Copies of this chain bind each other. A is one copy, B any other.
């Protein structure tokens, strides 16, 4: 291979210049299957890569793993291999009461509560999505009939204290994050996740295009628990949206 971690050569990509980048390698094949000629390329650690074809153009699907440091490796190596457009697909919880399970979130920019982004741009620089990618994602969502929210996501280097969770071993949240959730809610932040600050900052500062869509599978501010298909139907829809957006970006 010609990259450190992904175990891929440039020829494996067959000239692909767009990648769909879910977090979980288990989600990779399912996304690749929506497209033509799904072919598994490689699998190393949490980096599972498949190649497929969309309207006659090669497309890559590759997992990022959890967190900014893992994500930065995936993105940088994929960019080395010629990828110029990155579409993140995820499932997420929401932190706004009016956002319902089954809804779709498209992120215009992220709150940079991480560290890896700082290696690519100073904090003053916005973790902003590319306009064409965001447009494609919003339009694909509309095409599917999805109830869609477009706005800011909080991107945290932790799942627990950075998302102000108290149901933990210590039950403690450090001063920086005490009361932070209510502050992000008041500022209209839609949800938390862990990878987008890195993805968006590194792309926006390096001439690459990125966008992010996620299906809401839980809402910790609603007391109703998510249905049996707490994920499934919504996960399916989010995947459909990301593939349809990729079709408009080729």
Residue with the highest number of chain B CB atoms closer than 10 Å, among A127, A156, A174: A174
B contact residues around A183 at 8 Å (CB): 174-175
Report the stretch among A53-61, A106-114, A228-236 that lies at the interface. Answer: A106-114
A residues lining the B interface (CB < 8 Å):
4-5, 23-26, 45-46, 65-70, 72-73, 76, 79-80, 106, 108-116, 118-131, 134-135, 138, 150-152, 156-163, 168-170, 172, 174-177, 179, 183, 186-188, 194, 204-208
Number of copies: 6
Contacts known (A206-B172, A207-B188); A163 close to B118, Cβ less than 8 A: yes
The residue among A119, A129, A156, A205 with the most chain B CB atoms within 10 A of its own CB is A119
Residues of B within 8 A of A116 (CB): 67, 115, 157-158, 162
Question: Whole-angstrom distance from the CB of A186 to the nearest CB of chain B?
Answer: 5
